[PDB]
Design a protein around this ligand. Structure first.
Ligand SMILES: [Cl-]
Ligand SMILES: [Zn+2]
Length: 666
């Protein structure tokens, strides 16, 4: 039933290494049986029930079983279960490539479109049919069989390269060792948490909770230099080898499919449509931010000269990559009176989580209840059940996995586990999501204290959770977050706006000892500090967006060189010789390849919506929140992104709101 919880979460995290391997093969047997059945049908005999429905039914069954097999590599504490899940993921990705490239299925899907009365099927059924054919042509099934086989050969190779690129980064355990003197100006609560080694020194990993606090706060520039050198050479040798194979393969395949470049190939499936529009979007936006960057660079450089004079260090006359976060943090302290180590005392994990959940219950018309003694992949992970408030309909569940450990995904993300789609049964399948982040854990009496950007990250991922859960579609491939890649960061970045509002921030905050609120004064300063460093922060995102495009267009260019070019030309902060940032750039192997612009692309749509509707009619208004839920979250990828923006805005979007959020004009 669509009004109940029990029996609707089919997922299990019991699995032994043998159980993953055996179920991978079983799943392939069961799924291939359906594709064989559809392929065996005569061309004249195919119909909705035995071809279209049969494939869509098995897609649901496949995707659900697959996430019990491919997800444990990201969250299990057992190393052997992670490797089995990894090897399962590689196998199943080769299986996907085989089924996607079957000419007999593609032949029958095309025949069904010409002969079937397209007006009698649902609009999303027409979409399934149009997209399935589009995929077929994008997999080269219109080309000769000898070309198809070559394309297949390279796609299997590219899959394994992509999986190896990210595995190398998650499995990395590079550390550096420093004395107490070398970690100067880092707080005691940071340094006491670190592991002591021989010769009374401390161990610093290159993880996000270690790296950024050192680069932000450490006052010894040699320490910052060594940490940045280490961070931007993680997996250098092995992932440089991967990129040198990966990028030319992407080109070679794209050219065989009839595209000039790989960037052109991916852009066709995005709201931006074409690489010309992306290049124009980034160059135009780079131009507008240029004066902000020039001003921010000049203030930072003056500030360095003062600190170098005061502390008596040598002054090299430039902003190095290792100086960038340090003086950006310091600019925030001087201009907005914000100490992030003071401010986090007001954001304890329990108070933030409660505040976050209360915010979006009210806004989106939902009810969350935590489940007790829930089946989970770790003791520290919790499970919540999402209900519609008015109807009482059970929309989905989400897991919260907030704390770091050995083997876990290093970065912030949201994973789709179950789609919110129709079954063969006729009933609705319950959506399931996992919020994955890395904030400190409670030590003794001191609880987990969140910095403001950690709260924002928490809100970011919860935007993906709500998208995954509120999305109700007929078919599995359109459900949840399966939208255009350059649209998928609309719902996530949207929710970040509630972390820059005074009323919302007061609702999210409480001091951990005495329970006092943040001062009215300091809340104004926090909301006003949104603009601080915005030039260089946005300019860095343009560098990455530009690099990502360049590496997927002209693929006879050195990746590190290309990064250093845009670093100097756009950001005005040089990449340090010997470091290759692209080799660490996990988005290039995690499905944002040629699509990293999508963050900035989406932020235009998120700000335009936030300013035009939410900020006008009150940011906690249920009618606007329900209008957002129904028009943006609910359809999933069953409609185009730009149509879903049109339905909400009643017009095409524009950059006015985005530009106002940066402090510009048009
Ligand atoms: Cl052949
Ligand atoms: Zn995101």
């Amino acid at each position: 039933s669509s009004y109940t919880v029990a029996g609707r979460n089919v997922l299990r995290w019991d699995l032994s290494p043998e159980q993953i391997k055996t179920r991978t093969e079983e799943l392939i047997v069961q799924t291939k049986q359906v594709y064989d059945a559809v392929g065996m049908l005569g061309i004249e005999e195919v119909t909705y029930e035995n071809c279209l429905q049969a494939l869509a039914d098995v897609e649901v069954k496949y995707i659900v079983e697959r996430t019990m097999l491919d997800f444990p590599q990201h969250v299990s504490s057992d190393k052997e279960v992670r490797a089995a899940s990894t090897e399962a993921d590689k196998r199943l990705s080769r299986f996907d490539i085989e089924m996607s490239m079957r000419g007999d299925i593609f032949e029958r899907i095309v025949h069904l479109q010409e002969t079937c009365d397209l007006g009698k099927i649902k609009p999303e059924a027409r979409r399934y049919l149009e997209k399935s054919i589009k995929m077929g042509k994008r997999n080269g099934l219109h080309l000769p069989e000898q070309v198809q086989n070559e394309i297949k050969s390279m796609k299997k190779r590219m899959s394994e390269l992509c999986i190896d690129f990210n595995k190398n980064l998650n499995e990395d355990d590079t550390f550096l060792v420093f004395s107490k003197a070398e970690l100067g100006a880092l707080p005691d609560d940071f340094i006491d948490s670190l592991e002591k080694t021989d010769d009374d020194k401390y161990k610093i990993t290159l993880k996000y909770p270690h790296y950024f606090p050192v680069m932000k706060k450490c006052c010894i520039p040699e320490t910052r230099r060594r940490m940045e050198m280490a961070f931007n050479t993680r997996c250098k040798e092995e992932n440089t080898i991967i990129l040198q194979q990966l990028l030319p393969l992407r080109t070679k395949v794209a050219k065989l499919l009839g595209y000039s470049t790989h960037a052109d190939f991916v852009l066709e499936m995005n709201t931006a449509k074409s690489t010309s529009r992306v290049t124009a979007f980034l160059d135009d936006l780079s131009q507008k931010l240029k004066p902000l960057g020039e001003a921010e660079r000049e203030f930072i450089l003056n500030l360095k000269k003062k600190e170098c004079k005061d502390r008596g260090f040598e002054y090299d006359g430039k902003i190095n990559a290792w100086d960038l976060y340090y003086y950006m943090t310091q600019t925030e302290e001087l201009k907005y009176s914000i100490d992030q180590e003071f401010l986090k005392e007001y954001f304890p994990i329990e108070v933030v989580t409660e505040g976050l959940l209360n915010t979006y219950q009210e806004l989106l018309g939902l009810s969350f209840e935590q489940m007790t003694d829930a089946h989970v992949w770790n003791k520290s992970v919790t499970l919540y059940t999402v209900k519609d408030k008015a109807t009482g309909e059970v929309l989905g569940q989400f897991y919260l996995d907030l704390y770091p450990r050995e083997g876990k995904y290093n970065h912030a993300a949201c994973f789709g586990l179950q789609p919110g789609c129709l079954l063969p049964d006729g009933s609705r399948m319950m959506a399931v999501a996992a919020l994955v982040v890395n904030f400190s854990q409670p030590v003794a009496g001191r609880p987990s204290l969140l910095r403001h950007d950690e709260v924002r990250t928490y809100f970011h991922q919860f935007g993906h959770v709500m998208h995954q859960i509120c999305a109700q579609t007929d078919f599995a491939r359109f459900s949840g977050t399966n939208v255009e890649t350059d649209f998928v960061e609309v719902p996530s970045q949207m929710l970040e706006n509630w972390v820059w509002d005074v009323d919302s921030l007061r609702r999210l905050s409480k001091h951990y000892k005495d329970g006092s609120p943040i001062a009215d004064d300091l809340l104004e300063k926090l909301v006003a500090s949104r603009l601080v460093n915005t030039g260089l922060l946005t300019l860095r995102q343009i560098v990455l967006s530009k690099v990502d495009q360049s590496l997927h267009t002209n693929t006879s260019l050195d990746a590190a060189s290309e990064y250093a070019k845009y670093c100097s030309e756009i950001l005005g902060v040089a990449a340090t010789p010997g470091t290759n940032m692209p080799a660490t750039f996990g988005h290039l192997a995690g499905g944002y390849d040629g699509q990293y612009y999508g963050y900035l692309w989406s932020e235009v749509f998120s700000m335009d919506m936030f300013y035009s509707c939410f900020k006008k009619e009150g940011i906690m208004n249920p009618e606007v929140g329900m209008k957002y839920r129904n028009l943006i979250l609910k359809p999933g990828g069953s409609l185009d992104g730009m149509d879903m923006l049109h339905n909400f805005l009643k017009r095409e979007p524009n950059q006015k709101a985005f530009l106002m959020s940066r402090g510009l004009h048009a």
